[PDB]
Design a protein around this nucleic acid. Sequence first.
DNA 1: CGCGAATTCGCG
DNA 2: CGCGAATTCGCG
Lengths: 134, 134
Amino acid sequence: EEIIWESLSVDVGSQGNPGIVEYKGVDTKTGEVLFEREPIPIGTNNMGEFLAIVHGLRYLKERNSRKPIYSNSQTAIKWVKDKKAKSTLVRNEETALIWKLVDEAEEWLNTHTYETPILKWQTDKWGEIKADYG
Amino acid sequence: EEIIWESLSVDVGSQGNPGIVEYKGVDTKTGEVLFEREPIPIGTNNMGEFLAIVHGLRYLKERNSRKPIYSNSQTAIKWVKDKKAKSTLVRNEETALIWKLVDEAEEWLNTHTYETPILKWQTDKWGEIKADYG
DNA sequence: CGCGAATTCGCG
DNA sequence: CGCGAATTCGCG
Protein backbone atom coordinates (compact mmCIF):
# COMPACT_ATOMS: atom_id res chain seq x y z
CA GLU A 1 0.00 0.00 0.00
CA GLU A 2 1.93 0.49 -2.12
CA ILE A 3 4.02 -2.64 -2.70
CA ILE A 4 7.00 -4.17 -0.89
CA TRP A 5 8.38 -6.12 -3.83
CA GLU A 6 11.05 -7.76 -1.72
CA SER A 7 8.59 -10.08 0.05
CA LEU A 8 7.13 -13.54 0.23
CA SER A 9 3.70 -14.18 -1.33
CA VAL A 10 1.88 -17.29 -0.11
CA ASP A 11 -0.88 -18.94 -2.18
CA VAL A 12 -3.42 -21.72 -1.63
CA GLY A 13 -4.67 -24.03 -4.38
CA SER A 14 -8.12 -25.62 -4.08
CA GLN A 15 -10.26 -27.91 -6.37
CA GLY A 16 -13.53 -28.51 -4.53
CA ASN A 17 -13.67 -26.70 -1.21
CA PRO A 18 -13.50 -28.81 0.93
CA GLY A 19 -11.31 -31.03 -1.13
CA ILE A 20 -7.70 -31.40 -2.24
CA VAL A 21 -5.56 -28.48 -1.03
CA GLU A 22 -1.93 -27.44 -1.63
CA TYR A 23 0.04 -24.23 -1.04
CA LYS A 24 3.30 -22.51 -1.89
CA GLY A 25 5.41 -19.48 -1.05
CA VAL A 26 6.98 -17.49 -3.89
CA ASP A 27 9.23 -14.45 -4.26
CA THR A 28 6.79 -11.58 -4.98
CA LYS A 29 8.90 -9.81 -7.62
CA THR A 30 10.34 -12.75 -9.56
CA GLY A 31 7.89 -15.61 -8.90
CA GLU A 32 10.60 -18.00 -7.66
CA VAL A 33 9.05 -20.98 -5.76
CA LEU A 34 10.54 -20.92 -2.26
CA PHE A 35 8.52 -23.75 -0.69
CA GLU A 36 5.60 -25.95 -1.78
CA ARG A 37 3.29 -28.29 0.08
CA GLU A 38 2.26 -31.48 -1.72
CA PRO A 39 -1.53 -31.84 -2.04
CA ILE A 40 -3.45 -32.80 1.10
CA PRO A 41 -6.47 -34.98 0.14
CA ILE A 42 -9.04 -33.07 2.24
CA GLY A 43 -8.87 -29.51 3.53
CA THR A 44 -10.40 -26.08 2.95
CA ASN A 45 -9.05 -22.97 1.21
CA ASN A 46 -8.85 -21.17 4.54
CA MET A 47 -7.05 -24.01 6.38
CA GLY A 48 -4.55 -24.28 3.51
CA GLU A 49 -3.77 -20.57 3.44
CA PHE A 50 -3.46 -20.46 7.25
CA LEU A 51 -0.80 -23.25 7.03
CA ALA A 52 0.82 -21.36 4.12
CA ILE A 53 1.25 -18.14 6.15
CA VAL A 54 2.59 -20.04 9.19
CA HIS A 55 5.00 -22.03 6.91
CA GLY A 56 6.06 -18.62 5.55
CA LEU A 57 6.64 -17.24 9.07
CA ARG A 58 8.78 -20.22 9.95
CA TYR A 59 10.74 -20.09 6.68
CA LEU A 60 11.54 -16.38 7.13
CA LYS A 61 12.31 -16.62 10.85
CA GLU A 62 14.89 -19.32 10.42
CA ARG A 63 16.59 -17.31 7.61
CA ASN A 64 16.59 -14.14 9.71
CA SER A 65 14.64 -12.30 7.03
CA ARG A 66 12.98 -8.94 7.54
CA LYS A 67 10.79 -9.67 4.47
CA PRO A 68 7.02 -9.27 4.80
CA ILE A 69 4.45 -11.86 3.71
CA TYR A 70 1.54 -11.06 1.43
CA SER A 71 -1.72 -13.03 1.45
CA ASN A 72 -4.95 -12.22 -0.41
CA SER A 73 -6.98 -13.88 2.39
CA GLN A 74 -8.60 -11.64 5.02
CA THR A 75 -9.55 -14.85 6.85
CA ALA A 76 -6.15 -16.55 6.95
CA ILE A 77 -4.44 -13.30 8.03
CA LYS A 78 -6.98 -12.84 10.85
CA TRP A 79 -6.57 -16.47 11.99
CA VAL A 80 -2.77 -16.03 12.15
CA LYS A 81 -3.09 -12.81 14.18
CA ASP A 82 -5.58 -14.57 16.54
CA LYS A 83 -3.39 -17.71 16.72
CA LYS A 84 -6.57 -19.61 16.07
CA ALA A 85 -7.90 -21.22 12.89
CA LYS A 86 -11.67 -20.95 13.21
CA SER A 87 -12.53 -23.61 10.62
CA THR A 88 -15.96 -25.26 10.30
CA LEU A 89 -14.41 -28.35 8.75
CA VAL A 90 -15.59 -31.51 10.59
CA ARG A 91 -12.96 -33.45 12.58
CA ASN A 92 -13.12 -37.07 11.46
CA GLU A 93 -10.76 -39.71 10.03
CA GLU A 94 -10.67 -38.12 6.56
CA THR A 95 -9.82 -34.64 7.91
CA ALA A 96 -7.40 -35.75 10.62
CA LEU A 97 -4.25 -34.81 8.63
CA ILE A 98 -5.18 -31.19 7.87
CA TRP A 99 -6.47 -30.73 11.41
CA LYS A 100 -3.22 -32.16 12.79
CA LEU A 101 -1.21 -29.66 10.74
CA VAL A 102 -3.52 -26.80 11.73
CA ASP A 103 -3.39 -27.65 15.45
CA GLU A 104 0.45 -27.79 15.19
CA ALA A 105 0.65 -24.47 13.33
CA GLU A 106 -1.48 -22.92 16.15
CA GLU A 107 0.87 -24.39 18.72
CA TRP A 108 3.84 -22.86 16.78
CA LEU A 109 2.19 -19.42 16.85
CA ASN A 110 1.45 -19.81 20.63
CA THR A 111 5.11 -20.56 21.42
CA HIS A 112 7.08 -18.25 19.11
CA THR A 113 7.64 -14.59 18.32
CA TYR A 114 8.22 -13.19 14.84
CA GLU A 115 8.76 -9.76 13.37
CA THR A 116 7.40 -10.58 9.90
CA PRO A 117 4.67 -8.15 8.81
CA ILE A 118 1.65 -10.02 7.30
CA LEU A 119 0.17 -7.77 4.66
CA LYS A 120 -2.98 -7.93 2.60
CA TRP A 121 -2.48 -8.27 -1.15
CA GLN A 122 -4.78 -5.82 -2.98
CA THR A 123 -5.82 -7.92 -5.97
CA ASP A 124 -8.13 -5.21 -7.32
CA LYS A 125 -5.19 -2.85 -7.73
CA TRP A 126 -2.09 -5.04 -8.10
CA GLY A 127 -3.47 -7.95 -10.06
CA GLU A 128 -3.41 -11.42 -8.71
CA ILE A 129 -1.16 -12.67 -5.97
CA LYS A 130 2.16 -13.72 -7.47
CA ALA A 131 1.91 -17.22 -9.06
CA ASP A 132 -1.80 -17.61 -8.07
CA TYR A 133 -2.91 -21.23 -8.61
CA GLY A 134 -6.16 -19.85 -10.10
CA GLU B 1 -49.37 -13.40 5.16
CA GLU B 2 -51.95 -12.14 5.61
CA ILE B 3 -52.83 -12.26 9.31
CA ILE B 4 -54.23 -14.99 11.57
CA TRP B 5 -55.74 -12.69 14.18
CA GLU B 6 -56.72 -15.58 16.41
CA SER B 7 -53.14 -16.27 17.53
CA LEU B 8 -50.57 -15.82 20.23
CA SER B 9 -47.91 -13.11 19.80
CA VAL B 10 -44.79 -13.50 21.94
CA ASP B 11 -42.52 -10.53 22.74
CA VAL B 12 -39.12 -10.05 24.39
CA GLY B 13 -38.16 -6.97 26.40
CA SER B 14 -34.50 -5.95 26.66
CA GLN B 15 -32.60 -2.98 28.30
CA GLY B 16 -28.93 -3.50 27.53
CA ASN B 17 -28.31 -6.60 25.44
CA PRO B 18 -26.95 -8.59 27.24
CA GLY B 19 -28.75 -7.40 30.29
CA ILE B 20 -32.13 -7.66 32.00
CA VAL B 21 -34.62 -9.64 29.89
CA GLU B 22 -38.35 -10.43 30.25
CA TYR B 23 -41.01 -11.77 27.87
CA LYS B 24 -44.74 -12.21 27.49
CA GLY B 25 -47.38 -13.84 25.30
CA VAL B 26 -50.44 -11.81 24.30
CA ASP B 27 -53.61 -12.37 22.28
CA THR B 28 -52.78 -10.89 18.84
CA LYS B 29 -56.17 -9.24 18.21
CA THR B 30 -57.02 -7.87 21.65
CA GLY B 31 -53.64 -7.53 23.39
CA GLU B 32 -54.69 -9.60 26.42
CA VAL B 33 -51.61 -10.72 28.47
CA LEU B 34 -51.72 -14.53 28.55
CA PHE B 35 -48.40 -15.18 30.32
CA GLU B 36 -45.45 -13.05 31.48
CA ARG B 37 -41.97 -13.89 32.66
CA GLU B 38 -40.55 -11.74 35.47
CA PRO B 39 -37.25 -10.07 34.53
CA ILE B 40 -34.14 -12.27 34.42
CA PRO B 41 -31.08 -10.22 35.50
CA ILE B 42 -28.82 -11.31 32.61
CA GLY B 43 -29.81 -12.67 29.22
CA THR B 44 -29.92 -11.67 25.55
CA ASN B 45 -32.81 -10.62 23.31
CA ASN B 46 -32.48 -13.85 21.34
CA MET B 47 -32.38 -16.14 24.42
CA GLY B 48 -35.44 -14.36 25.84
CA GLU B 49 -37.48 -14.67 22.66
CA PHE B 50 -36.46 -18.35 22.26
CA LEU B 51 -37.84 -19.02 25.80
CA ALA B 52 -40.93 -16.95 24.92
CA ILE B 53 -41.76 -19.08 21.84
CA VAL B 54 -41.18 -22.35 23.76
CA HIS B 55 -43.34 -21.04 26.69
CA GLY B 56 -45.97 -20.25 24.03
CA LEU B 57 -45.75 -23.78 22.57
CA ARG B 58 -46.22 -25.29 25.99
CA TYR B 59 -49.09 -22.95 26.90
CA LEU B 60 -50.97 -23.76 23.67
CA LYS B 61 -50.26 -27.50 23.77
CA GLU B 62 -51.67 -27.96 27.22
CA ARG B 63 -54.83 -26.01 26.23
CA ASN B 64 -55.26 -28.06 23.05
CA SER B 65 -55.16 -24.90 20.95
CA ARG B 66 -54.76 -24.87 17.19
CA LYS B 67 -53.67 -21.20 17.44
CA PRO B 68 -50.44 -20.16 15.72
CA ILE B 69 -47.64 -18.14 17.37
CA TYR B 70 -46.21 -14.99 15.85
CA SER B 71 -42.67 -13.77 16.56
CA ASN B 72 -40.81 -10.89 14.88
CA SER B 73 -37.48 -12.73 15.43
CA GLN B 74 -35.98 -14.65 12.50
CA THR B 75 -33.36 -15.92 14.96
CA ALA B 76 -35.66 -17.20 17.72
CA ILE B 77 -37.94 -18.91 15.17
CA LYS B 78 -34.93 -20.63 13.55
CA TRP B 79 -33.58 -21.75 16.96
CA VAL B 80 -36.97 -23.28 17.85
CA LYS B 81 -37.15 -25.14 14.52
CA ASP B 82 -33.55 -26.40 15.05
CA LYS B 83 -34.24 -27.27 18.71
CA LYS B 84 -31.03 -25.47 19.46
CA ALA B 85 -30.40 -21.97 20.83
CA LYS B 86 -27.12 -20.92 19.24
CA SER B 87 -26.31 -18.12 21.70
CA THR B 88 -22.86 -16.53 22.08
CA LEU B 89 -23.62 -15.56 25.66
CA VAL B 90 -20.82 -16.76 28.00
CA ARG B 91 -21.70 -19.52 30.50
CA ASN B 92 -20.64 -18.31 33.94
CA GLU B 93 -22.22 -17.76 37.37
CA GLU B 94 -24.08 -14.60 36.30
CA THR B 95 -25.61 -16.26 33.20
CA ALA B 96 -26.37 -19.63 34.79
CA LEU B 97 -30.12 -18.95 35.22
CA ILE B 98 -30.89 -18.00 31.60
CA TRP B 99 -28.71 -20.84 30.34
CA LYS B 100 -30.53 -23.27 32.66
CA LEU B 101 -33.89 -22.15 31.24
CA VAL B 102 -32.57 -22.32 27.67
CA ASP B 103 -31.09 -25.80 28.12
CA GLU B 104 -34.45 -26.95 29.60
CA ALA B 105 -36.47 -25.38 26.77
CA GLU B 106 -34.21 -27.28 24.29
CA GLU B 107 -34.83 -30.48 26.20
CA TRP B 108 -38.62 -29.80 26.02
CA LEU B 109 -38.41 -29.36 22.22
CA ASN B 110 -36.32 -32.61 21.93
CA THR B 111 -38.94 -34.64 23.82
CA HIS B 112 -42.28 -33.27 22.59
CA THR B 113 -44.37 -32.83 19.45
CA TYR B 114 -46.58 -29.84 18.72
CA GLU B 115 -48.79 -28.75 15.86
CA THR B 116 -48.52 -25.01 16.53
CA PRO B 117 -47.41 -23.07 13.43
CA ILE B 118 -44.65 -20.53 14.30
CA LEU B 119 -45.10 -17.59 11.97
CA LYS B 120 -43.02 -14.53 11.24
CA TRP B 121 -44.63 -11.21 12.13
CA GLN B 122 -44.16 -8.74 9.25
CA THR B 123 -43.53 -5.52 11.17
CA ASP B 124 -42.99 -3.50 7.98
CA LYS B 125 -46.53 -4.24 6.85
CA TRP B 126 -48.54 -4.96 10.00
CA GLY B 127 -46.98 -2.56 12.45
CA GLU B 128 -45.31 -3.73 15.55
CA ILE B 129 -45.85 -7.07 17.20
CA LYS B 130 -48.87 -6.84 19.49
CA ALA B 131 -47.94 -5.17 22.84
CA ASP B 132 -44.24 -4.74 21.81
CA TYR B 133 -42.16 -3.74 24.86
CA GLY B 134 -40.37 -1.21 22.60
C1' DC C 1 -19.52 -24.86 -5.68
C1' DG C 2 -18.07 -24.07 -0.58
C1' DC C 3 -15.48 -21.36 3.07
C1' DG C 4 -15.54 -17.84 6.67
C1' DA C 5 -15.04 -12.43 7.46
C1' DA C 6 -17.40 -8.30 6.95
C1' DT C 7 -21.51 -6.02 6.42
C1' DT C 8 -26.51 -5.33 6.59
C1' DC C 9 -30.69 -6.36 8.73
C1' DG C 10 -34.44 -6.23 12.35
C1' DC C 11 -35.01 -5.89 16.99
C1' DG C 12 -35.42 -3.84 22.12
C1' DC D 1 -25.45 -0.37 22.18
C1' DG D 2 -25.23 -5.66 21.40
C1' DC D 3 -27.19 -10.08 19.38
C1' DG D 4 -27.16 -13.50 15.69
C1' DA D 5 -29.28 -14.58 10.75
C1' DA D 6 -28.90 -13.36 6.13
C1' DT D 7 -26.35 -11.44 2.64
C1' DT D 8 -22.21 -9.82 0.24
C1' DC D 9 -17.47 -10.27 -0.47
C1' DG D 10 -13.02 -12.29 -2.28
C1' DC D 11 -11.05 -16.42 -3.28
C1' DG D 12 -9.66 -21.12 -5.89
